[PDB]
Structures are given as C-alpha cells and as structure tokens.
Amino acid sequence: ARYLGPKLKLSRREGTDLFLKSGVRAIDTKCKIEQAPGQHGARKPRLSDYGVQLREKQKVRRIYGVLERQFRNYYKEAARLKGNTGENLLALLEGRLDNVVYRMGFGATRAEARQLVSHKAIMVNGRVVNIASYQVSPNDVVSIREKAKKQSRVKAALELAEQREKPTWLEVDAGKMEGTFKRKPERSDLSADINEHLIVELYSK
Amino acid sequence: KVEYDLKRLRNIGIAAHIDAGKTTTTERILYYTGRIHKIGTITAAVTTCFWKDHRINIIDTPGHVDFTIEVERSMRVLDGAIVVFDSSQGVEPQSETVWRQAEKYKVPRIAFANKMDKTGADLWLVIRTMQERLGARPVVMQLPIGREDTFSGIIDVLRMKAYTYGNDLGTDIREIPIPEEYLDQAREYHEKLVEVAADFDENIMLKYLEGEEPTEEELVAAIRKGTIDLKITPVFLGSALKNKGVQLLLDAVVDYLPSPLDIPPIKGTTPEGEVVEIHPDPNGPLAALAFKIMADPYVGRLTFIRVYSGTLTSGSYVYNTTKGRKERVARLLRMHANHREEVEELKAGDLGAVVGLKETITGDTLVGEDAPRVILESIEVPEPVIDVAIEPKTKADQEKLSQALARLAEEDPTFRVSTHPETGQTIISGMGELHLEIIVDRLKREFKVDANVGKPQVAYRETITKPVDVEGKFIRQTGGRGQYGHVKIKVEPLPRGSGFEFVNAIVGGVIPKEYIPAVQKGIEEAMQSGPLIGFPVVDIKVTLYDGSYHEVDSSEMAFKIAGSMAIKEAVQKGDPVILEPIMRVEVTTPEEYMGDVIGDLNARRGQILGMEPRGNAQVIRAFVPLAEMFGYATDLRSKTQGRGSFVMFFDHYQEVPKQVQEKLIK
C-alpha cells in the first residue's frame, strides 16, 4: 500500500515540487515538470471548488506518501483532538517517524527515510521501530542503529539535508546519526502553500 | 516396522462381459484374504485385503454393458486385472470386448474360467477362443479334475501339485496328490508351460534342452516377467460359487500380478508446459489423482484417491490444481471388507479415501500445498451414442430438471446436456440404452420430475424448384407519410448447398441508392418462415432487377417490406420443396455381420457408399436421414451382438420423397 509509481509525475500534477526526486539536483526541470501531467498536458485545468478543494489534500497526501484511508483517520484524528483542526492534521503527519527522518537528514527522500524504517534501520528511545505510521512524541530520541551505520545512502542523505531550510524542532547529529525530537511543529514552521480548511472542508461536507 | 514394501502392492480390477462372475468372484476373494480366525456389497469403490504378506486393492464394477467408461477408468488408476470368463458360455460371442479395451490403455492381466461346474463348462473351449477371438498367448496353468458336474479337485502344472474340494461351502479342501489316471495329461502342459516360460528366461531354456528342471522360483520369474509385458495371459479356473480355484487364483495374483513398481510411471504437466514422469517414490512431490466421490452418512463426502508420488498425510493441507483450490485433508481412510480402518497416510502407489475437501470432483489432481502445481493426464474420451427428447411438461418441471443435472452432472460426467439450438427441447446425451434409461428413473424419481420422452426433431429447410419473378408493391398514399415502396425480383433455385445470393441489378437507379440495404434486410428476413411449414427457406439466388419509388413517400422501411413481399411470394409460387438433413456415418463391423448391417441401413431411406477394410474389421460409409436414424446404437449393436460401432457427421440437405411432403404438413 505504498504509492510505488512514477514519483515525479505526481508533483507535476500538483503544480509544485514535493521533493520526491528530492535526491540530488532540484527545482526540478531535468524531469519534464508542469505543462503535461498527462497527454492533454497543455490543457488548462479550470475547476470546481471541489477540484481545487481536493487537489490540496490530495497533494498533501502525496507529499507525505499517505493513502486515503490512513489519511482520513488522520483527519478524523485532527477532529478528535482540541486545536485548529487543520493544524492538528498537519502535526499528526509531522510526527510520522518516516517524516521525522527525512526531516533529520538520515533520509534523502521521505519515500526513502521510510525505506529505512521498514528495514528496522532506526530506533527511538532504544527500541528499534519499523512502522512508518509510528507517531513520535516530544523527548523521543530517534537514531540509526549502529549496525548498518554511516552507510552509502545515509551519507548524502544527512548531507543535502543541511542545504535544506533545515527544521528547528529537532536536534540532529551526524557522527552519531542520533536525533532528538524536541517539540510539536507549529502551523508557523513548515507550510505556506498548503491550505487546511480546504482539506477540512473536504472531509467536512 | 516398515509394513510397506510397495513391492507387496496388488491393485487389481475384475473385468469381463456381463453374466460372467465379476461381482460374485469378488465377495469370494473377500472371504479368503480375510477369514483369519487365529487365536486372538462392494462397500465403496476400492477395498483392501491381505493375502500372504501382500495388500490387495480391488475395484469390481466393470459390467461392460454398453457403457464401459467406468471400467476403462479404474483401469487407468489400477495396475493389474483378472479377466473373468464364463466357462459355460462357450459359443461365447461376448467373452470379448472387455480385454481388447484393456491393452487399449496398457495394463497386464490374468484369466479366470469361472463356471467350471456349469453345463458346457469346457476349459479348452475358452482358450480355443482366447486366441481365436482376441488372439493373445494364454498359458494353461491348471487342469480341472472332473469336468463340470464332477468338479472335485484341480492341478497346477507349474508346481505339479494336486488339490481337491470335498464340498462347495469352501471348507473341506486339501492338497491331495494326482488321482490315479490324469497324471500323464499333466507333464506335457507343464512342459509347454516351461517351454513357454522359455521365451523369457534363457536359463529355463537351456536347462530345458539339457535335461534339468527350472527351479520353482526361476520358473515363476519367467511367467511373471512375461505376463507383465503383455505377451502372455496365465489362465486358471474354478467355480467361484462353490469356492474352487479361488485360494489358488489368489496365489495366481501376487505370483504374476504386477506391483505398483513393475508398472510404467504416470505423465503429468508442469504449470509451464512440459510432460514429465511421476515417480512412485513416497518422498517426492505429493501427486495424487481422485476418482470417486461418495456421500457417507457417517463421515460425509468421501474422495477415493490413487497416489503416485509423495505421500498424503492425515491432518494436513493439499491443493487441487484442477480447480485451484486449497483442500484441507483431515482424516485418511481405508475400506476394509467389513469395517472402517482409519489410517494415517497413503504413500505413493497406495489407494483409499480422504475426508474433507469440497471442490474436489472426479479426475482431480492433488499436489502438496507448495509442490509444483502440476496436473496429471487422465484424458479419457468416451463420448455418447444415444440421445432422447426430454420436454419437462409445464414450465414447472422444466426447473426440477435444471437442478436434476446441476447435481447429476457432477455425480456422473459420462454424459452431456444440450438445449437444441433450434427448438427449445433438450437432448440427453448417453452411452447406451440402459444408460439414459436408468437416468429416466432417478431423474424422474429421486427428482420427482415428470416430463416427456420421445425423440428429437429434424432441422428441415425450405426452398424451391422453378425460378419465378413477381411484383413487390406497397404504396399507401392517403395524405402525408405516403409510404411508397415497390420492387421486382428474379428468384432462381440453387444447388442443394448453395446458400444466399442477392443481385443489385438496378440500371440507372430507378430504386435509390440509400434504400437497397433495406430492401435486402427485408428479403433476407422474410426467408425465415418457410412457405410450407415455416423453416429457413434456403439455397437460392435473388435478383433485384427493378422497382420504382416516390420522392417524399418512400422510406428505408417501406422498401424492406416491399422486398420482403417479393420474396414472401416467389417461393410460394416457384413450387416449394421440404429439404431435410443427411448424415455421414461409418459403422465399424466384422464383415461377419456386415451382410445385414448394410441391409438394415438400406431399409432406412439411406444409400450406401463403400467399405475399405480396417484391422480385422471393415468400415461402411453412407448417408441417412436424421429422422430414420434415431436410437441407432441399440440397432447396430443388434446386427452385431456388440462387435459394432459407428460415428456420424452432417453433410447436406435434400428433398423429401413427396410422400413425406404431405406427411410433414403438421
């Protein structure tokens, strides 16, 4: 139940980059971005509050590599909790182990960070964890297992991570490859071009 | 604690033409092999019995009676066979069949002369036939003391010992030496036996000419190594009713009857596609075939199976590739001639029944639950020979009948159900009179359905003799959608087997371009209900050479009618003729019966075509009307006492003898 297919071909559609070739070069181009997410590629997408109001969450979903089910529950979650309900849905995503590993630097792409967690190449407070879903909490201590450490991938991984805007709410290492999870990401940090009362309106009607 | 040497397995079938002694012979075998008594119904398909350190599996059921198929099914699974013969029936015309259909598969067998006590019971007379009819190389293995009413003891040449029977209850027997006279008669037959056994063991050949006697052990080896190759057939004897020659026939079993090992491996196919032998090793993949389902009141569905490779295990999981299904075998079971022995496993070459499984119907291939999802062969092709008309009375029964086959077609795929593609009524494919007959009891009884049972109808055809030409007018001018169509055609008969040909014979265009399609769909159409009885008026060429029209009134449709009128009448006018179906048939028969065979066919509105010999038989080709061709099986098998078989194909349609013209006006 992972997406699996042509990663880039997605960003094209959402009209952004979601960092799915995240890998190396960037601001795509060298890909084919934009004016043809299909064959009537040119064609203007004029559309519905429904079409726009979808594309937002649909896109977000794509960003984190979540599937509509888990996602719904995230939303119902956001709902269940106190706080701006879109904001919560965002945190809920941000606490994803997988998220919190690309966000450390350990992983080149989120889609890869996860590749590691599945393979128990990762620990929290001393227990190997290996479910991407795993919700991380303030004061946790995510890290690479010693075995399979400073390896191939994780190298450039931690690397280009620095060139990234670089988070805040996590202290990371590199020698260690250990990483604190320090607090729960504010609406303020991470964001701008992402519109929650849309992907709430959605599940709201 | 091996208890399974394999080389101790005897899987045998009792075949032979009806009357015989098959059934009776079996219950008997199942009394000796298990009378035990030591200081301490063919109840389901196959049964196990022990005879001197040897397990025997029997499947008596043959019957021959028209429909064999079953006989030829067990035959494939099992390895050995006794072809019981009725000693008495001497001018025996049906001793045959049975066998000529055995080597037909490739399996070894010994012969038994059963009623050696009933009048006319002449042993030789059989052999004077077993080489005269089928023509094999049987080997006298015994000589009876007291032909028929004077049935006392018997003698085994190979072992030159004499036994006797003081009664017929099967108790007071004994091995009493040769009674004065006789003796001499033996020798010679015991020499030829050894002389026969010579064509196998060179050792039993020299020692012959040198003056030494082959060892009672190397002698057996010859006979045995000789039968198993389908070269010889050891003949024995004894009144099975009087319990005589049975306990000796049983030895005859092991001594000459093949073991699951002496037999040639089953071929199967991988999921990829490639033949491959299936080795009788109780440690290779699990490969077993099924062959008989049965509903047990106590344990439910039972699926008797013949293992070939690996080994099925009680409380495991199997997999049927045939119907891609994961069956869960829970309990294994072996049928003892009187109780339910619950064992724990069947190793390759062994036979019994599993309990569980739901999707496993006949001929299913069960492998391990990971083994190469392979499928054996099994391909048997016994089609039908006799069918009937079955019209389920009021639509009510038409249903009870649907369910009828919905369960009866699984409990016996030796038939076929078909809805005549031309007239509702459904056909019931059988394999001989009796067959369909006894279905007619169960399908009507244990299904309470009560329909009709007459004969099929015949797919007739209409056409004409003389070519005609008539007007096709329509016009309806009153005030608006005028409806104006009209055409003239050229109708002309074509050779019986011509088809449908129209002719766009319009000059400048008196009949617009756009309307011709429709004037054809009209003619083409009308030809549906004939002018005589209402059948597909066919075998003609049509020519549209004229017809006018109107600027506003005409219609695509208005023309389809006009043309459907020109035709609806040219056929009425050109003198119609009720054509009918002619078949191609080929009766395979010994020119012995031939004489009348051809006759009967002539007196069937048919006309003969030839007979180019085949094998020992001879084939006859010719045409016939499907009407005067019904229930031919039980008519061919009449002029041939069974030695007759036929095929059938369609060919053409042809006029009815006029006398049959006004006949059909029904």
Added chain:
Amino acid sequence: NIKSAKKRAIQSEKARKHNASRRSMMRTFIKKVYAAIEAGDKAAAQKAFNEMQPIVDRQAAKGLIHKNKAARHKANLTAQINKLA
C-alpha cells in the same frame, strides 16, 4: 437415556413411592380430623387432632411437607375445634 444417571431416575422412584406413602398416611390422618369437626364431635376431633399433630410436624421436619404446611394445618384445624367445641 444412556447417561450414567439413568440412576437418577430410579433414585426418585424409590423416593416418590416412599413419600407417596407417608404423604398419603399423613393426609388420611388430617382427613380423619376435619371429619370429626365437620360432624360436631368436639372430643373425637381433639383426640384425632392429637393423633395427627406429631405425624404432621414430623413429616414436615422430615422434609416432605416442610414447615408452614403443618402450621397452616394444625393452625386452622385448631381454630375449628374451639369453634364449636
């Protein structure tokens, strides 16, 4: 029905047949009583009342007619004698 405690059956037979008797005998006596009253025979009653009492109470603490039955009985019966006796 085959199930060890077919016995249970035969047990309650012996049982019934026993209580049957007593119970009977007991009624028999209490009947002797209302008879007396029912006629007017003050003393004969009392007498037969005395006779039944011990048998009542007894058969009760024995079990087969526990407690308040006797009560009720010796009760109303009593009430009856000093009704018109």
Added chain:
RNA sequence: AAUUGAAGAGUUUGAUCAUGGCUCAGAUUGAACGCUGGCGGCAGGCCUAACACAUGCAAGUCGAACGGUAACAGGAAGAAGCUUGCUUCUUUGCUGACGAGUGGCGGACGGGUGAGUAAUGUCUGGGAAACUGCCUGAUGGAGGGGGAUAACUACUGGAAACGGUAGCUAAUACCGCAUAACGUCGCAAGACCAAAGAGGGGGACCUUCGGGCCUCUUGCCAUCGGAUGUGCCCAGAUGGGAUUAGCUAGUAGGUGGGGUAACGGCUCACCUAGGCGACGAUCCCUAGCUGGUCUGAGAGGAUGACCAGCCACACUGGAACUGAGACACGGUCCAGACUCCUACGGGAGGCAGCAGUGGGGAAUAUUGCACAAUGGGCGCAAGCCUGAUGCAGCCAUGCCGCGUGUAUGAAGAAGGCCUUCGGGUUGUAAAGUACUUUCAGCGGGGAGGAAGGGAGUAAAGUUAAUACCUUUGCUCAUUGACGUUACCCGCAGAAGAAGCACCGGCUAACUCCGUGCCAGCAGCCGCGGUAAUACGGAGGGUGCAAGCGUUAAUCGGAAUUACUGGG
C-alpha cells in the same frame, strides 16, 4: 480535560420565480456477487428451514458413607519359576486401587435458541405476605433400638432392551423410641417434631490385639441471623390498524372454607353486581425486552449479530415426579408427528450443546489440539470430568498495520497513442548503474502466559504430647494446548508479491479509431440515425489500493410527516 457542531447539485419552462416529486455526492453492513488478491494483528462467521438429522464428543465424581472383589499392580502363612535371591501360583481383598451395585453431591450451572410472547415479559422506580443447596456468624444437641433391600447365589422368561421367583447382607438407605426450645401450634395452660457417622495421628494402660481410650479433622440433626438466589405485588414507559367500539360469569367485589414458601378468585360454596373501555379496551397484524448499535449537528429516524443483563423455548401438545431448586437442554409418563432396531412376539431415539451431514439459500468455516491458563462439578487431598474456556484450522468479511523496493538516470531510447508532421506525450517512467533486505523462504537463538501442586524441612497453632492436622517460611526436583510462540540473530538476492472503477454534467480525469437510433450505454438528466469527450477498443488521465466495483439495506442529504423545523 470529558457528545464544542449544521454545505449542496441535476431535472417541469423558450426564458423566470415558486411549488413539487424524483436523482446523486457521506457514512454504515453478520453481507452477497464480478474482477483481482502478498503478510500479519485483532475481531466476525446459518441473517434462510424453531428443517431433518449418520457418527464421535458436550456431566460427572467420592472407596475419607457401604457391602465389596472383577480388572492390574504389587505383596503373603504356605506352597516354588530356581539360572541357591533374581524369583512364580494355589490362592488370599492383605492395601495401592477399581468394573458392576447402594449411598452422597452435581445432572435446575455451564452451553444453544428467538419459535412463542405487545405483558405470568422487558426497562425504570417503590412495596410485602415469602422460601433459599453449597459458603457463612451464634447456640445446643449428637441417646438407644429395629425390619429391610441392590449388589451377590440358585433356579428361571426373553432375539434383544429388559425381566421372573426364592435366598443372603452392609451403611452417611429407611423407620421407630428416647431427648425437645430462643421451634411450631396455641392469649395461656398445655401439646409436638431431629439427627450419621467417617478418617488421621497417639503415650502410659490394657482388653474378646479388629479396637475401647486420648486427641484432631471432617461430616450428622436443631432454631436464630448473614450473604446469594428465587417467588411475589405495585405505578410509569414499553410496536401498527377504528376498513375492529364495545368487552367480561371466576367475570369485578364480599364472606367462609380449602390451597401454596408466601400475598392473592389461587380454588370453591355463598352473597354482591360489579370490573375494563376513546387517557383506545376488545379484536386483528407484527415483535423477545434492555444496556447498547448505525445514522444524524442535535432533536429524531433505523435497529437489537458478536459482548453483557432479564425473559422465553429444548421435535410438537400435555403432565406431574424427584429436589434446596425444574414442572428439567443430553430426566420421567401420556398423546402426536417421525426415524431407527427386531429372530416379528417386541423394542430405541430427538444436535436450538461442539464438530459434521442432508435440505433451503446470494451466502456462513474443521467430524482439530488441550485441560497448561481462568472457571465449574465431585473430592479432605491428589486427582478425575469439563466441545464452559483456552487455543489452532477455514473464509480479504471488517477493522489495523506492512509489503510489493530506495536512490540515480536523459536530450529524454526504442515501441505505443496524438500530431496542425516542427513535435507531443507515456516519462524518471524504462533499461544502466549503484544502495537497502522488514515481510514470505532457510537456518540458529529464544521471553511470558506458571499461579500451584509434589516431597523434604523450620518453626508457630493446638493437643498428653515434639506424632497427625492448619498456616507460615525454607530448600529440591517439577507441571503449557498453543508451539517451528512472540521477540532477537544471522544467509541470499529486487529477489516472491497489483489490482479494480471511472474520465458528458452532476464529478476528479480526453483525445484517435471502430460503429451509424445498429451494436450498445444509462444513478438522474440522456447518449447512439457518418467526424460519439456518453456505445466498444486504444493512448492518456482521475480515484481508490490488496483491494475495486456492483447489488442489497439503514440513516443522511429530505425544512420531503416540519418538537426542534412546513403548509
């Protein structure tokens, strides 16, 4: 901190507003079907025929109540298998034990079912006239007699299931008699009722060497309470119909007897003439009730599978017996329907227990392992029994996680689809190249569910007492079905793992070709009669994903039964 949450669209007209139906987008499911399908975790699994049922299992247990020996183990005066310590039979019940029999306790629980039942029901809340095994507190009893019986022996009828005579015998079986109050009866005075012994261990002493005796446990009877259970009354709520408006004779009330564990027309004689009913009786149809559950913003609507409470039923109708308890789910008698056996005379049985069969149906799974865990029965105990229960098997049925790779790759390959032939697109997609290896596969490692019981000891309880018994430690060897357990460690190679629907509008997604009111689509509006974004194929795309659809169905949208909230 703890119900804080309410969205509309399409379609009447040439156009409009309104009214008004119809239709869709959401959630939900004990589902089914079509296509497709990798793993696991947890739940679910006959909704129809309360249809019929082969077989096996689902209730036993105590020898510390009893006469006992038939089985298998042992021993034994004494006889022997002898191969002069290894030991075999006559027996002998001598004890460890145990078939059959008596007795005791349990078979009124557990488990199944929804057929009946619109009130001997359920929920909510009060009440009084009651009984209550096993557990429990209090106080007394526990004296002394008797006659039976099964088992068994003889003889005997039966095919069998099961009897028939006559013996003989035991107890915690039965019955007397004594005893008798804080019991019952009675204002009182009086009167009246009960019972069972059994084991363990013991110095002196000793006797009919079995024991009396001493002591300890456990049982037996009685009344009073406790607790649990149960019966019982009352008012309120508890579906539809008036195209059912009248109902009722034990009927409503009284009295008196009788009745029950108890109040009571519960039953009867008698008197009264009442009693119910538009606040809906009666009649007819339907239904187990609840906690809950789905839906909704809520109010409502719909519902009452699994889990838990109550009720009801046990092939159908009827009935009592035994008992603390039943009018009994593997009890009894009758009647009925029905099947089985039979030697023909006569007999046996009821899966709505677990599994399984047939039948019905769109549909619903194994004749599994285990008493190791909790729990129930009997027992002092150990034990035995337990289809309760714990588990495993089957099915994508649901929910929940996981995987099916991760990077990198360009003038952007070929092929395919479009193309105004410039190219476009599929497309970082592929391939190439690095890197990872969870999960399936292999092989090792390896938790917890295990508390207790068993002996050894140490005491402290009692007691004549250090024996024995109760608790307490102490020590020692041990008790899982699951089970190749969870979890961990390695081995190899991307290796074994993607599919379904949609793309005219509602509605996210479009072009080409085929077709020519045909073939066909279609939830509504409506597509199709030669350039079809609607049919069918392809390319492309959109949505979902080991699922996707489709059908079925409840609520929602529906302010469209409008209390909230309309006319």
